[PDB]
Amino acid sequence: SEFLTVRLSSEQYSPIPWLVWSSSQQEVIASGELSDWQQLDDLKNYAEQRPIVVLVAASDVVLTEVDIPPGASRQFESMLPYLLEDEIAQDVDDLHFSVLAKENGKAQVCGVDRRWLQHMLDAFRAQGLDVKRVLPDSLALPLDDEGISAAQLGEQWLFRHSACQGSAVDDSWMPVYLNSVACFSSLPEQQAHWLSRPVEMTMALLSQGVADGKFSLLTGEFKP
Amino acid sequence: RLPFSFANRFKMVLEVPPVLYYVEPLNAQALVEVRRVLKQTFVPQAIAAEAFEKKLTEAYDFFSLAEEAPIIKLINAMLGEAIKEGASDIHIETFEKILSIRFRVDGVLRDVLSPSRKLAPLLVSRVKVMAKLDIAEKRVPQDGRISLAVDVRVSTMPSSHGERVVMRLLDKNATRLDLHSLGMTPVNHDNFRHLISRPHGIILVTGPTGSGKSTTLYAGLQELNSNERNILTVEDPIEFDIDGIGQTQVNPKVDMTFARGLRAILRQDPDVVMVGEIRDLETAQIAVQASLTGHLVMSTLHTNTAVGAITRLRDMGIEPFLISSSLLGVLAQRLVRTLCQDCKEPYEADKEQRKLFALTLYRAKGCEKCNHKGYRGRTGIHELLMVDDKVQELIHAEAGEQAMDKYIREHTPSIRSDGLDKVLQGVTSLEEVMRVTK
Ligand SMILES: Nc1ncnc2c1ncn2[C@@H]1O[C@H](COP(=O)(O)OP(=O)(O)NP(=O)(O)O)[C@@H](O)[C@H]1O
Numbered sequence: 057s058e059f060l061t062v063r064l065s066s067e068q069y070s071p072i073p074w075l076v077w078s079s080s081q082q083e084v085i086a087s088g089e090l091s092d093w094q095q096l097d098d099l100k101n102y103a104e105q106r107p108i109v110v111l112v113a114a115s116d117v118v119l120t121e122v123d124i125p126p127g128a129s130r131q132f133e134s135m136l137p138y139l140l141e142d143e144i145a146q147d148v149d150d151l152h153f154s155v156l157a158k159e160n161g162k163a164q165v166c167g168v169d170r171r172w173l174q175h176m177l178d179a180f181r182a183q184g185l186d187v188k189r190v191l192p193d194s195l196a197l198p199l200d201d202e203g204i205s206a207a208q209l210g211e212q213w214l215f216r217h218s219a220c221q222g223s224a225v226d227d228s229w230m231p232v233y234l235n236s237v238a239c240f241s242s243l244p245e246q247q248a249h250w251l252s253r254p255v256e257m258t259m260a261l262l263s264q265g266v267a268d269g270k271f272s273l274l275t276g277e278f279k280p
Numbered sequence: 281r282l283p284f285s286f287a288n289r290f291k292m293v294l295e296v297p298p299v300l301y302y303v304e305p306l307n308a309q310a311l312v313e314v315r316r317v318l319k320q321t322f323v324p325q326a327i328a329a330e331a332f333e334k335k336l337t338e339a340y341d342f343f344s345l346a347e348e349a350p351i352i353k354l355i356n357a358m359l360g361e362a363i364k365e366g367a368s369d370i371h372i373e374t375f376e377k378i379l380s381i382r383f384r385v386d387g388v389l390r391d392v393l394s395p396s397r398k399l400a401p402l403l404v405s406r407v408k409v410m411a412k413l414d415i416a417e418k419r420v421p422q423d424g425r426i427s428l429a430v431d432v433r434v435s436t437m438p439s440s441h442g443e444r445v446v447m448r449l450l451d452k453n454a455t456r457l458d459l460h461s462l463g464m465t466p467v468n469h470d471n472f473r474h475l476i477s478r479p480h481g482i483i484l485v486t487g488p489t490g491s492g493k494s495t496t497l498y499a500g501l502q503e504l505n506s507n508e509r510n511i512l513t514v515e516d517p518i519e520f521d522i523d524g525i526g527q528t529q530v531n532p533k534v535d536m537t538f539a540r541g542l543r544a545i546l547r548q549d550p551d552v553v554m555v556g557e558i559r560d561l562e563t564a565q566i567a568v569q570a571s572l573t574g575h576l577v578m579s580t581l582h583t584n585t586a587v588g589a590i591t592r593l594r595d596m597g598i599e600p601f602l603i604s605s606s607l608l609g610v611l612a613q614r615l616v617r618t619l620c621q622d623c624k625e626p627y628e629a630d631k632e633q634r635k636l637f638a639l640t641l642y643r644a645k646g647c648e649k650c651n652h653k654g655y656r657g658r659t660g661i662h663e664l665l666m667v668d669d670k671v672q673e674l675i676h677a678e679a680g681e682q683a684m685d686k687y688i689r690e691h692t693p694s695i696r697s698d699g700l701d702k703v704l705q706g707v708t709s710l711e712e713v714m715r716v717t718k
């Protein structure tokens with residue numbers, strides 16, 4: 057009925073937006089923002105007896121598509137790091153991968169730094185907070201039939217390209233990155249066809265998507 | 281810096297306000313991947329293929345010696361003593377009756393030695409020759425440089441009693457973290473400088489997530505970073521590479537843990553050891569045995585207070601006797617956002633606010649420079665617990681947190697008190713100190 061959504065990133069100095077959404081009432085019960093990761097103790101009061109969903113920043117996550125080698129669907133996940141080894145900019149052993157979808161001859165993948173994800177879970181565990189789900193913040197945006205769904209959070213633009221594909225980019229180089237966009241916030245002074253949708257609070261909008269979807273990076277080694 | 285494999289493939293180079301040079305057509309997927317790895321924003325700049333390839337290739341004892349030429353050794357020892365104490369500037373000044381030398385350590389001047397006045401012209405002559413300056417000329421200012429990885433800038437100037445010399449000591453390493461610039465006070469830095477300089481014992485930097493405990497350890501290791509010491513570390517992961525220090529990374533693919541990595545480090549004949557953190561008893565036991573067998577150990581814990589770190593070692597299973605003999609000190613630390621200097625609004629503190637300390641404090645407000653927060657940047661506030669004779673007794677006897685907090689408040693300032701001093705200076709707000717301090 058009610059759940060706490062928390063938006064985290066790799067930047068420990070950056071703010072941590074949170075929001076208590078109620079699917080029963082369809083309303084925002086509580087809302088705030090931690091300044092640093094030093095305030096993780098403050099989330100105790102807002103969690104109480106409610107599931108915690110962590111929204112990792114899509115900027116701190118690799119969301120990409122890869123071709124499944126013919127007739128190797130059952131062993132695909134073991135071959136996943138090696139197929140993406142050239143396409144990531146660090147050692148692929150460092151990343152933890154989660155298959156979001158398998159359709160036709162392609163698979164939808166989400167990678168994240170293993171040590172960061174483990175460290176985030178250890179930070180919440182030290183505070184007595186039990187994280188139920190972890191997913192990319194961009195994938196919590198709603199799908200639109202007329203274009204790419206977008207929303208501004210802080211000084212970043214979240215983009216959901218499709219069901220499993222997504223991204224988060226800074227305002228400074230957002231226009232260069234895009235080279236139609238259904239926007240659920242105030243339109244920027246940038247960009248390339250921006251369709252204005254009814255404006256909502258981004259964390260409230262994301263929370264509604266969290267209630268709809270089942271995606272979670274807590275898989276394999278990170279399963280509860 | 282990106283990996284060469286990635287940069288060569290997608291045609292993207294990073295050269296530092298970080299600039300990201302690229303060749304068209306730009307790949308949106310690869311652009312996001314660069315943002316993920318750096319954990320920082322950048323400025324994309326388009327470049328032609330020919331100019332890109334060139335950018336890619338270019339990218340990838342003083343005191344004892346004073347009582348006894350002999351001048352050459354004295355000046356070299358003085359410079360070694362300056363780097364030891366962490367001096368920024370060396371002042372050699374000649375008066376009528378007295379020759380005096382002074383260091384400025386973290387902004388604060390200090391008397392080091394006042395030798396015989398007769399030596400005055402010889403010290404001026406030696407320092408000039410090292411910097412390729414004119415020995416005979418004494419009527420004009422002369423400026424020179426030396427490389428010793430220390431880059432000293434030296435300036436002479438005429439005075440009424442000869443010439444006055446100043447040597448500005450600067451490290452060429454641009455990634456050097458100055459512990460005072462990070463936020464430590466001159467007294468806290470000296471006490472921490474002395475603690476990490478010891479031959480053996482454990483030092484713990486504690487605080488919650490994002491308290492700057494890794495950054496403080498790194499700055500401490502960089503200060504010790506010398507060829508006379510063998511410094512090694514186990515990390516999970518390695519935050520960034522310090523040149524000269526051997527950094528091992530924790531690897532679960534070969535079952536290389538903190539404990540197993542720490543044992544391997546101890547067979548490498550180290551002087552100083554740094555363990556990322558002590559999560560379990562196994563790693564704690566090894567770190568304690570290292571400290572009792574002639575190794576300086578540095579690590580971290582996620583406790584809210586400096587005294588909580590001692591209680592944490594107690595709770596993990598380390599025997600009180602072993603904690604008292606091993607532990608040198610605990611550095612409790614928090615980060616507080618620094619107020620924007622352009623838009624910070626002054627206000628006089630009320631009676632409830634004055635209890636914590638016309639007392640003028642500063643508020644956040646906000647403007648386009650901070651955009652639009654009121655703060656810009658961060659700085660550290662600290663509480664350095666120093667394990668002395670009486671602290672060793674209290675750990676052995678198991679006096680508890682309550683009785684131990686009593687004695688600790690008599691000698692060492694609190695983390696709030698250090699924070700409140702910065703509020704008086706106008707660096708951070710009272711709201712930010714009270715946020716991170718409970
Ligand atoms: N003294 C400081 N002044 C300004 N910025 C700082 C300072 N110390 C750390 N930072 C920045 O703040 C972030 C947090 O610092 P960090 O050293 O990672 O904290 P930490 O407590 O060691 N993290 P963790 O290991 O997760 O508990 C880093 O990204 C630094 O760049």
Ligand SMILES: [Mg+2]
Nearest residue numbers: 493494495580
């Ligand atoms: Mg750390």
Ligand SMILES: [Zn+2]
Nearest residue numbers: 620623647650
């Ligand atoms: Zn301002």
